Structure 1
């Protein structure tokens, strides 16, 4: 963005694909870094009393 509407209309008239909508230069759509810290699962193991490795 940060351009006037005259050259914007020239860009839209040079190719009609709504150039203001999808501009390939993202500003604050980026998800924020330094996220809340993750907790991670353990899958179909770590439940005790059955899981012999001889079985699986």
Structure 2
């Protein structure tokens, strides 16, 4: 994304496609490496009543 406009134009002409729309090099658009802590849900068997294992 640091390329000049002339190099971008030559690159797009020789490739035939708009390469700047879909760049293969990742930038600040991806998610952060530090995330807030999660809270995962529990399954259907996490019940206090009517939870007999033989059923």
TM-score by structure 1 length?
0.86
Report the counterpart of residue 20 of structure 1 in structure 2.
20
- Segments of structure 1 that go 5 or more residues without pairing to the other structure are none
* TM-superposed deviation, 1:16: 2.0
Per-residue Cα deviation, 1:21-46 (whole angstroms, up to 9, x for no partner)? 11101110110122110001111111
TM-score for both structures, normalised by structure 2: 0.87
CA RMSD of aligned residues (A): 1.0
Higher relative contact order (CA 8 A, sep 6+): 1
CA distance in 1, matches of 2:12, 2:51: 64
Runs of 4+ in 1 over 4 A off after TM superposition: none
Using the TM superposition, give the Cα deviation of residue 9 of structure 1 relative to its aligned residue in structure 2, in angstroms: 0.8
Q: Secondary structure at the match of 1:12?
A: helix
